């Protein structure tokens, strides 16, 4: 699949993504390098934060207990649609993905 990436600037990239890979995954081994991502797809650090686009939220499996408080200590301040984004697991049904990506993450 395919997912999209908005800048701060409002600028996009498609990036390919194979089933399985996390968003992240799929950010770093194309090309953007915003999403510092420190503990390395590890869930125990805030520095891989996405934005996930108003409507694509409703497509994915739920934040859990441990990702919803790594993300009240996000650089950025949390938004309703924040989620880690090496804790989201791209399947066909998220082919086309939107994710914009925070000011900072670090
Ligand atoms: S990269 Fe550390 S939580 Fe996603």
């Excluded at 999403?35 to 590890?42: L, R, S, T, Y």
């Excluded at 309703?80 to 998220?94: G, V």
Aim: with cysteine; aromatic share 4%.
């Amino acid at each position: 699949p395919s997912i999209t990436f908005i800048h701060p600037d409002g600028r996009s990239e498609i990036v390919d993504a194979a089933i399985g890979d996390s968003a992240m995954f799929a950010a770093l081994n194309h090309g953007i390098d915003s999403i510092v991502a420190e503990c390395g797809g590890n869930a125990v650090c805030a520095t891989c934060h996405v934005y996930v686009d108003d409507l694509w939220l409703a497509k994915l499996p739920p934040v859990d207990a441990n990702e919803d408080d790594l993300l009240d200590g996000t650089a950025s301040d949390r938004l309703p649609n924040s989620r880690l984004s090496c804790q989201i697991k791209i399947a066909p049904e998220l082919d086309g993905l939107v994710l914009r990506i925070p000011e900072r993450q670090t």
